Amino acid sequence: GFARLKRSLLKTKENLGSGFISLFRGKKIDDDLFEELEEQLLIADVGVETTRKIITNLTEGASRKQLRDAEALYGLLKEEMGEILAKVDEPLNVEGKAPFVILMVGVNGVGKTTTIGKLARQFEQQGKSVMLAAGDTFRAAAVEQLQVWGQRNNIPVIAQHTGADSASVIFDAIQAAKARNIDVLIADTAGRLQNKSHLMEELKKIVRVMKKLDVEAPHEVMLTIDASTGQNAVSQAKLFHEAVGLTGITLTKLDGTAKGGVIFSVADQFGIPIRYIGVGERIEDLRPFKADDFIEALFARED
Hints:
It contains twelve helices and eight strands. With about 300 residues, the chain is an alpha/beta fold. The chain folds into two domains: about 5-85, Four Helix Bundle (Hemerythrin (Met), subunit A), CATH 1.20.120.140; about 100-300, Rossmann fold. An eight-stranded mixed β-sheet has the order 3-2-4-1-5-6-7-8, with helices on both faces. Helix 8 runs parallel beside helix 9 (about 195-210) and helix 10 (about 230-245) runs parallel beside helix 11 (about 260-270). Belongs to the GTP-binding SRP family. FtsY subfamily. It is found in: Cell inner membrane; Cytoplasm. Keywords: Cell inner membrane, Cell membrane, Cytoplasm, GTP-binding, Hydrolase, Membrane, Nucleotide-binding, Receptor. This is Signal recognition particle receptor FtsY.
């Protein structure tokens, strides 16, 4: 089962899931074992707080159930780590709005830009009309790239001059989307490192301005983070959630990285739905996140 996801997760499976089997084989359950397991979770980018919760719960469960052999910790870990992910399994539903507005937030990266295009194409294949808003207004190269992409894919892109006000660009885009019967408007935003107060004040202005057109907009505030950046994904999630209020997360680049364990930290620390995971280069490899498939792929040793 799940051979494709197992292949995407191959490097992560060295240390988590099926990777636990070689760690536990032949060992007794004692303090040394739990210290080694903690180290392995941390090396896998599970994060201090999520690791501590897992260890606390596993230690108490093994003690109360009077478990003897470390091999039995595998099934308990599958339950505990599986529950972490199941709590954030909720696919994005974009139906029935005029338009449904997705505000795309996160730092600048190939992940966010690529995710906009993949989602746009998926929605079009689903029969929806899409429009993009070039809200990263001071990055002229990024605006031009989005315009080129829309022209290549015959998807309209609303943009203004370099240095335009991002809230105004996005407002104008929502107006154009409403006027033109667009089903889904995907709004890009700035994601610059320097000066946090500026970025967060900009995002708050974008959201406030939309409300004159639709009190329900933005219908989704989606963060994009890159699994290969380890704890930077978690600190980015914390920054953006504290500032705007996320309703969904896309985690990219789960394939080919040994850092896939960060999904557990993101899930546990914030409790925000993980809408999509990026597990390859094709449009269709931005997959709706299914926690059960993911845990089975991660933990199963068969192919």
